[PDB]
Amino acid sequence: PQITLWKRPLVTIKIGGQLKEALLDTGADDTVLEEMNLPGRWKPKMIGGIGGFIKVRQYDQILIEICGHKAIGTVLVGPTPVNVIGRNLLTQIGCTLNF
Amino acid sequence: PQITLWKRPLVTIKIGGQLKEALLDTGADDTVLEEMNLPGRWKPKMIGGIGGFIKVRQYDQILIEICGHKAIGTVLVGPTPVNVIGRNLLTQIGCTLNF
Numbered sequence: 001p002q003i004t005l006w007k008r009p010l011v012t013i014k015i016g017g018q019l020k021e022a023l024l025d026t027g028a029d030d031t032v033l034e035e036m037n038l039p040g041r042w043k044p045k046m047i048g049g050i051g052g053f054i055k056v057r058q059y060d061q062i063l064i065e066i067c068g069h070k071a072i073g074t075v076l077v078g079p080t081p082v083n084v085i086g087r088n089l090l091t092q093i094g095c096t097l098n099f
Numbered sequence: 100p101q102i103t104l105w106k107r108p109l110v111t112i113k114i115g116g117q118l119k120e121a122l123l124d125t126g127a128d129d130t131v132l133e134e135m136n137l138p139g140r141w142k143p144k145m146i147g148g149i150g151g152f153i154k155v156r157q158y159d160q161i162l163i164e165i166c167g168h169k170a171i172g173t174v175l176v177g178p179t180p181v182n183v184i185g186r187n188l189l190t191q192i193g194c195t196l197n198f
């Protein structure tokens with residue numbers, strides 16, 4: 001679709017068989033989701049943002065559907081203020097900025 | 100133009116008679132720029148993201164030229180790790196997400 005930016009660009013995602021709401025975030029290199037029970041192996045990792053660094057669980061090769069578009073890649077789980085879809089997955093669904 | 104997301108969506112902006120580089124960031128509600136000395140009255144504000152909050156100065160009705168496209172709105176200035184153009188100005192230049 002074409003998504004304007006008057007409101008937050010929130011979309012429904014499906015991950016680990018569960019539906020969630022997430023923000024399409026072109027300023028995020030990586031995808032970060034709030035604490036959740038996700039199937040798969042994981043490794044501790046640190047990710048930094050505007051306020052500093054947080055500890056996350058790094059899951060690799062996770063299936064995630066973003067408004068019906070399938071992606072398979074890295075998902076970080078940790079104390080983010082909001083679920084954010086970063087460029088690592090936005091590229092997989094063919095997302096571009098246009099103006 | 101059309102901006103793919105393989106790389107950081109960095110562009111040149113002009114603000115207060117200065118050229119700077121900034122990220123087109125659909126995840127930022129408001130535009131936040133590195134410490135800069137801007138004429139005018141301002142309001143203190145706190146903005147939060149991954150890792151917590153930072154303190155910024157809120158300037159209203161600031162003009163910014165983004166790849167030749169003019170926008171006028173709120174600009175937050177403070178010790179941000181990154182310059183971001185947020186939705187408050189991205190809407191003004193007609194920016195959409197497309198996939």
Ligand SMILES: CCOP(=O)(COc1ccc(C[C@H](NC(=O)O[C@H]2CO[C@H]3OCC[C@H]32)[C@H](O)CN(C[C@@H](C)CC)S(=O)(=O)c2ccc(N)cc2)cc1)OCC
Pocket residue numbers: 023025026027028029030031032047048049050051052053081082084086124125126127128129130131146147148149180181183185
């Ligand atoms: C020099 C580098 O230092 P740094 O690595 C951190 O640098 C950064 C810091 C922030 C960004 C931009 C933010 N992306 C982000 O958090 O992405 C994470 C995950 O993917 C990684 O890629 C980059 C960082 C990692 C996001 O787009 C926008 N944000 C809100 C989101 C979270 C939704 C609420 S907001 O910034 O909080 C923000 C809040 C209110 C307003 N009005 C304006 C902005 C990009 C690089 O060190 C740590 C001190």
